[PDB]
């Protein structure tokens, strides 16, 4: 009852993958159906900037590029058990959001 959606946002693939597997297996511990994990399309932030502080010299541009990875999990369960499952420890770089679904 009262399906719950959890969103996992990060920049590192390894941390997100390990915590997603951990959370899904923890949900499976309570014998709970889980639809997922759903690998949200990664979003890329691209920025280009000129290295030279003054425009002198041949124009060379560096291209910084950041990746944002996301996973989403839907659990058909009461929210309290979802909070119990996610109450366990976390690793750096991963943000957890919970919503009513």
């Amino acid at each position: 009852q009262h399906r719950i959606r959890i969103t996992l946002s990060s920049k590192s693939v390894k941390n997100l993958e390990k915590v997603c597997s951990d959370l899904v297996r923890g949900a499976k511990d309570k014998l709970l159906r889980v639809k997922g994990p759903v690998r949200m399309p990664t979003k890329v932030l691209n920025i280009t900037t000129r290295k030279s502080p003054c425009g002198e010299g041949t124009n060379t541009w560096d291209r910084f590029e950041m990746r944002v990875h996301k996973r989403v999990i839907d659990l058909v369960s009461s929210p309290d058990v979802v909070k119990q499952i996610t109450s366990i420890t976390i690793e750096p770089g991963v943000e957890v959001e919970v919503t009513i679904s």
Partner: protein, 208 residues
Amino acid sequence: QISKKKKFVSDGVFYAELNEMLTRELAEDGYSGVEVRVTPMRTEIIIRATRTQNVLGGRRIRELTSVVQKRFNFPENGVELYAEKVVNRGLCAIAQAESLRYKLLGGLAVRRACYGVLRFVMESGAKGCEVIVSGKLRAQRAKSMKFKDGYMISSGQPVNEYIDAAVRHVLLRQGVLGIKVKIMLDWDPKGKLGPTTPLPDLVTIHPP
């Protein structure tokens, strides 16, 4: 509410601001980075220092904890800030960077100061070290002078995790001297010393 992209940029620039603020206040103690985590209802921001008994003074740590709470409009009783001791002072690049800065500012000859720092980093157990000092030492003309030894890689992906580098601009009496310190870390599978992965050129063999 605030979108994910703007929030991520805000935390990135906020961490940079925190680093800049803390590195310009703990010159007497050797600020050596910060770790920030977001637990449910808590935002932990632990400062690192080579000398920790002087950071505590623990009232001053509580003032610096309120610093981020009230300057950045953070909620009360949701932000924590403590101090921590370096695992290895020598293996930390910035630690020896401002150590050399302090040594040259005190009155020691720069050459002897870099020899001392160079001996200290091998005391820590570095694979190799390099210290570069650029600017005017005694004469009007500026010069670049280097002391390097040990393993010193210079290119490729392994350069950004198998080395630790630090650069500083020490304001001397006659100008500004640029100092750079680079330390190679060995392969520690646990990861406490340096990287947790071996080098591409480093291959181990099990005897038959």
